[PDB]
Design a protein around this ligand. Structure first.
Ligand code: CA
Ligand code: CA
Ligand code: CA
Length: 247
DNA sequence: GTACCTGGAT
DNA sequence: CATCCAGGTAC
């Protein structure tokens, strides 16, 4: 059923909403999420566990209309899959790395102008895997070795995503500073591996390969795999789970 | 360096 | 809609 901590969650979110505009705690796209976590007095972490007891929290700037990142997970196989993808199919960046950012769909192939390969997802319902298909520019499928088992994906959903509190927000730039304001929250439940994979097949949920580079700090110029992400179109949540207003 | 975390701008 | 991308850390 429902989390024992939903009331506490509502109070924690309400406290942030009541705070109005908040200056960013970290410059960059990530700031919206880092700023919210700081307000909840949550130290950043890299665990695939929920944020607030058993509840996952996600912030989302409504006007930006970006895909909602659900979770990341490296391929089940082969070993070193993302390194292989980068090395074989990436493009050269300013530092001499290969990079590979591709938002991949299950209903159509990419048509990349800046990369020399195209990509599609096959949901293999018989074998219960999510498979990446790589095509050359002559439309030949050259590599479908990379996959995620349904079991792996279900394990991430069970660990992290039973209850997803999505906090809708806005931003502004004022006096050369970036601010966020958190306005409302919905609870998204009943996402299953079966609904996830249906969404990938239909194009509403993407498999996002996100291999870039670091651009500042000690690691500047080094390869930065942000993790392959499973990302949902916010307009489509009701087709993949249930949604109710909580704040 | 890999694999997780947090997310857009155009 | 699609194309391409951003700042963090544990180990
Ligand atoms: Ca988290
Ligand atoms: Ca979160
Ligand atoms: Ca299929």
């Amino acid at each position: 059923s429902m989390s024992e901590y939903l009331n506490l969650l509502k109070e924690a979110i309400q406290n942030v909403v009541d705070g109005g505009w908040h200056e960013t705690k970290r410059k960059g796209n990530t700031g919206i999420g880092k700023t919210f976590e700081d307000l909840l007095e949550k130290e950043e972490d890299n665990l695939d566990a929920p944020d607030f007891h058993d509840i996952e929290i996600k912030t989302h700037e409504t006007a930006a209309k970006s895909l909602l990142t659900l979770f990341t997970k490296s391929p089940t196989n082969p070993r070193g899959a993302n390194t292989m993808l980068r090395n074989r199919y990436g493009k050269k960046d300013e530092y001499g790395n290969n990079i590979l950012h591709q938002t991949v769909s299950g209903n159509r192939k990419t048509n990349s102008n800046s990369y020399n390969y195209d990509f599609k997802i096959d949901i293999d319902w018989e074998s219960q895997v999510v498979r990446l298909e790589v095509f050359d520019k002559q439309d030949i499928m050259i590599d479908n070795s990379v996959y995620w088992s349904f079991d792996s994906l279900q394990n991430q959903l069970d660990k992290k995503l039973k209850y997803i509190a999505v906090i809708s927000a806005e931003s502004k730039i004022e006096n050369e500073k970036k601010y966020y304001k958190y306005n409302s929250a919905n609870l998204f439940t009943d996402l299953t591996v079966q609904s996830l994979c249906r969404g990938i097949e239909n194009g509403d949920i993407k498999v996002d390969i996100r291999i870039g580079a670091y651009h500042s700090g000690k690691k500047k110029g080094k390869t930065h795999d942000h993790g392959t992400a499973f990302r949902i179109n916010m307009e489509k949540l009701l087709e993949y789970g249930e949604v109710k207003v909580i704040v």
